Amino acid sequence: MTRFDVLTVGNAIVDIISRCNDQFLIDNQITKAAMNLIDAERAELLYSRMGPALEASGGSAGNTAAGVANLGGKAAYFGNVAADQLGDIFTHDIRAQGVHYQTKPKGAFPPTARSMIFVTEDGERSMNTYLGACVELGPEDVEADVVADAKVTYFEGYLWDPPRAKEAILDCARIAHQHGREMSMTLSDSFCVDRYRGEFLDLMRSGKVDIVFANRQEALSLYQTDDFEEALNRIAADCKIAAVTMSENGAVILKGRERYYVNAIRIREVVDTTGAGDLFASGFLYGYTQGRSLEDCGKLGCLAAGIVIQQIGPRPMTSLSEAAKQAGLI
Amino acid sequence: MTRFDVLTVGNAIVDIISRCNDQFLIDNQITKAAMNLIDAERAELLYSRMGPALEASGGSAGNTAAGVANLGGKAAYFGNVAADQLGDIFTHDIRAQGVHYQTKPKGAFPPTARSMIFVTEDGERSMNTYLGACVELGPEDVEADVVADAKVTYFEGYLWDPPRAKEAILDCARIAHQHGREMSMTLSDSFCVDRYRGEFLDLMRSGKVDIVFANRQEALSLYQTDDFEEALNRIAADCKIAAVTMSENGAVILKGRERYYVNAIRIREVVDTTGAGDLFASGFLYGYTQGRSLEDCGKLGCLAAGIVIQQIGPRPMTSLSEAAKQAGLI
Numbered sequence: 035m036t037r038f039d040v041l042t043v044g045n046a047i048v049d050i051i052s053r054c055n056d057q058f059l060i061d062n063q064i065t066k067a068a069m070n071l072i073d074a075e076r077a078e079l080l081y082s083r084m085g086p087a088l089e090a091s092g093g094s095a096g097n098t099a100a101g102v103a104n105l106g107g108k109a110a111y112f113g114n115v116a117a118d119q120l121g122d123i124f125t126h127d128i129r130a131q132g133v134h135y136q137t138k139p140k141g142a143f144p145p146t147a148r149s150m151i152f153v154t155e156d157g158e159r160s161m162n163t164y165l166g167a168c169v170e171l172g173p174e175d176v177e178a179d180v181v182a183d184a185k186v187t188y189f190e191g192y193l194w195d196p197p198r199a200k201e202a203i204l205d206c207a208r209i210a211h212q213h214g215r216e217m218s219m220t221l222s223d224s225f226c227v228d229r230y231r232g233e234f235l236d237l238m239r240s241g242k243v244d245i246v247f248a249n250r251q252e253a254l255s256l257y258q259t260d261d262f263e264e265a266l267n268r269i270a271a272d273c274k275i276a277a278v279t280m281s282e283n284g285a286v287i288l289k290g291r292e293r294y295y296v297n298a299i300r301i302r303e304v305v306d307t308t309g310a311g312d313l314f315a316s317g318f319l320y321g322y323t324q325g326r327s328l329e330d331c332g333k334l335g336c337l338a339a340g341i342v343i344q345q346i347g348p349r350p351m352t353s354l355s356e357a358a359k360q361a362g363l364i
Numbered sequence: 365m366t367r368f369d370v371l372t373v374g375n376a377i378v379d380i381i382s383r384c385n386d387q388f389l390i391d392n393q394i395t396k397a398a399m400n401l402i403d404a405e406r407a408e409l410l411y412s413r414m415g416p417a418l419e420a421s422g423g424s425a426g427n428t429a430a431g432v433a434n435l436g437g438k439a440a441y442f443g444n445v446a447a448d449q450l451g452d453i454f455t456h457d458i459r460a461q462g463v464h465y466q467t468k469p470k471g472a473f474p475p476t477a478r479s480m481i482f483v484t485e486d487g488e489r490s491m492n493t494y495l496g497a498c499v500e501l502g503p504e505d506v507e508a509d510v511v512a513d514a515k516v517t518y519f520e521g522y523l524w525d526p527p528r529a530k531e532a533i534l535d536c537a538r539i540a541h542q543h544g545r546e547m548s549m550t551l552s553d554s555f556c557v558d559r560y561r562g563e564f565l566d567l568m569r570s571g572k573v574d575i576v577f578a579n580r581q582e583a584l585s586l587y588q589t590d591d592f593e594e595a596l597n598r599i600a601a602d603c604k605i606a607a608v609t610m611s612e613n614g615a616v617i618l619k620g621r622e623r624y625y626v627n628a629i630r631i632r633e634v635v636d637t638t639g640a641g642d643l644f645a646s647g648f649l650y651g652y653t654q655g656r657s658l659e660d661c662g663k664l665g666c667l668a669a670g671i672v673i674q675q676i677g678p679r680p681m682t683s684l685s686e687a688a689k690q691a692g693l694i
């Protein structure tokens with residue numbers, strides 16, 4: 035028996051969500067479809083220009099942990115919020131989903147991270163993230179017992195932006211592997227890959243990471259190539275298992291020379307793509323830790339991702355376990 | 365020319381929204397479909413039992429002012445938040461919709477009001493409201509020039525719960541009527557009517573209120589009758605204009621002996637009824653201040669109400685002006 039199926043580690047963020055037109059992004063020099071880091075002054079400026087908004091707990095890894103719990107797995111999360119109202123909201127939402135979350139706030143400043151997410155008419159999402167209290171996440175926040183007792187510890191490439199989070203992750207990798215567990219990461223965002231390419235490849239090649247999640251753009255960025263076939267060949271050589279999503283084209287799971295192609299689910303309409311990759315990882319890691327085949331892991335990931343893009347908010351409000359049962363996956 | 369079409373005054377609240385099953389309401393002794401006042405301790409208890417939630421700016425009059433602005437009218441709002449993150453969210457959302465909102469927080473404590481709103485499968489909403497900083501609203505928060513320059517000042521029956529808000533409303537009524545403006549109120553909630561029946565009837569009969577909004581339950585409660593026809597006859601005798609909504613069954617506008625009936629719009633599915641009455645008031649009051657017939661005012665109210673119940677959140681995220689144009693209400 036192990037206490038946890040999946041521990042995730044990431045930047046603890048509350049999302050501030052609004053729809054905008056295409057010109058808004060141009061006028062405000064926001065890179066479309068990407069995670070744009072911003073300082074406090076820029077956060078105030080952008081907020082002053084944003085329309086009425088909705089708030090929802092976010093954070094890539096936070097969403098993934100929530101998704102695992104939703105499917106019925108046992109999940110835990112490490113991430114740092116402030117002792118403020120946004121932090122209280124973040125804390126409530128992840129615990130309410132049934133995720134173990136015990137990271138202690140350090141104070142009220144910097145305040146809890148928030149990301150202004152602008153959703154264009156095509157359903158694409160452009161994020162503008164003030165890291166706030168996320169910059170304080172470090173080795174002191176590693177619950178060593180939790181890492182030791184988790185089948186998979188999964189973390190964000192996004193953690194390479196704040197200063198000390200990487201130290202916590204290296205500690206996690208040591209503990210996880212000493213206890214025969216698996217380490218996983220997501221490449222997070224293609225510009226994030228542009229920033230930390232070499233460090234990410236070192237994590238994979240040194241065996242600190244066993245299972246890597248990427249989308250098409252991230253895989254291309256990792257090898258600075260426009261040849262997707264090359265990117266797949268190289269990523270398969272650099273890590274034990276790679277799961278590469280291709281939006282409406284589904285996904286491909288790679289292990290050594292093995293490839294398993296999975297279709298995207300049929301959807302009603304793309305409301306908001308926020309969380310698609312996070313929830314693909316939820317479905318995959320849920321399947322993985324339930325001993326399911328790699329193809330079935332991919333199928334579970336595509337199911338969860340397809341569900342989340344049909345709602346506002348990055349964490350499915352409906353039952354993923356019921357959806358999996360209905361789709362004949364569990 | 366007048367600076368404002370509609371000034372609204374109410375409890376400034378951020379909503380915390382989650383779906384629940386029918387048994388949840390019974391287990392927690394929450395009165396279904398009603399506004400349940402709660403203290404700080406109960407707020408903590410209920411939050412600890414609530415599932416993952418979404419936050420959205422609320423407050424009945426706040427929603428109404430936002431709706432007027434959305435339709436293209438000129439709106440202002442009085443309501444008191446605290447100097448905290450929820451208050452900043454509230455301030456941002458209403459100002460971003462184009463509503464004049466200049467009520468200054470008095471400090472951080474009590475904190476900004478919030479309402480835990482539980483939405484059952486039928487789309488009904490059951491609210492659990494901690495008033496917080498709303499208890500500080502008083503005559504000092506009346507911007508006399510704004511009241512003087514607003515065609516209609518509209519307020520919540522809900523303002524009779526906090527201690528000094530009624531004094532602000534009596535000041536508003538004096539200024540509005542001295543400047544030849546109209547006063548309006550909503551009965552808010554049938555239990556609120558149970559609490560303040562006599563005071564509400566005195567407001568109407570003394571002519572401090574010119575235009576009254578009610579739903580069926582509130583009208584029945586006002587006269588402690590189960591005879592809806594009696595309630596209509598009585599409410600028509602007690603105020604200059606009464607606008608009475610009957611949920612899915614439309615609305616009736618009363619002026620003296622005149623009655624103008626309106627049909628409800630067509631719904632695919634009722635997602636969440638939160639804000640329906642508020643947005644009925646937005647449509648009606650926008651039409652009224654544009655010099656439209658009482659029937660057309662009712663039509664605009666029903667249009668706005670029908671739109672808001674098809675989304676999560678109490679303030680329409682789509683263009684009400686565009687919908688009104690499409691409907692030939694313009």
Ligand SMILES: Nc1ncnc2c1ncn2[C@@H]1O[C@H](CO)[C@@H](O)[C@H]1O
Pocket residue numbers: 044045047048049069091092093094095097149161163190192193308309310311312348
């Ligand atoms: N820098 C970041 N690190 C981790 N997650 C982020 C970052 N910026 C935005 N997000 C989250 O990405 C999610 C979508 O994958 C959103 O819910 C949002 O909170």
Ligand SMILES: Nc1ncnc2c1ncn2[C@@H]1O[C@H](CO)[C@@H](O)[C@H]1O
Pocket residue numbers: 374375377378379399421422423424425427479491493520522523638639640641642678
């Ligand atoms: N006591 C109250 N006073 C005014 N508005 C309230 C109260 N409780 C809940 N609400 C608001 O009622 C709205 C729905 O009519 C919600 O957006 C919610 O914020």
Ligand SMILES: Cc1nc(CC(=O)O)c(C)s1
Pocket residue numbers: 050074077078079081148150164449450452453
């Ligand atoms: C409470 C909040 N303040 C802001 C503005 C800021 O971060 O400066 C949000 C986007 S949410």
Ligand SMILES: Cc1nc(CC(=O)O)c(C)s1
Pocket residue numbers: 249250279280281282307310311314336339340343
């Ligand atoms: C529409 C979708 N985008 C993704 C992530 C991606 O490939 O960018 C899914 C898993 S589904």
Ligand SMILES: Cc1nc(CC(=O)O)c(C)s1
Pocket residue numbers: 119120122123380404407408411478480494
């Ligand atoms: C930030 C928040 N705290 C709570 C709990 C409380 O009010 O005590 C909410 C409903 S929202």
Ligand SMILES: Cc1nc(CC(=O)O)c(C)s1
Pocket residue numbers: 579580609610611612637640641644666669670673
């Ligand atoms: C579902 C609806 N409720 C109302 C208000 C009510 O009658 O309770 C509308 C105008 S539409």
Ligand SMILES: [K+]
Pocket residue numbers: 306307308309342343344345346347348349
């Ligand atoms: K989404």
Ligand SMILES: [K+]
Pocket residue numbers: 636637638639672673674675676677678679
């Ligand atoms: K609604």
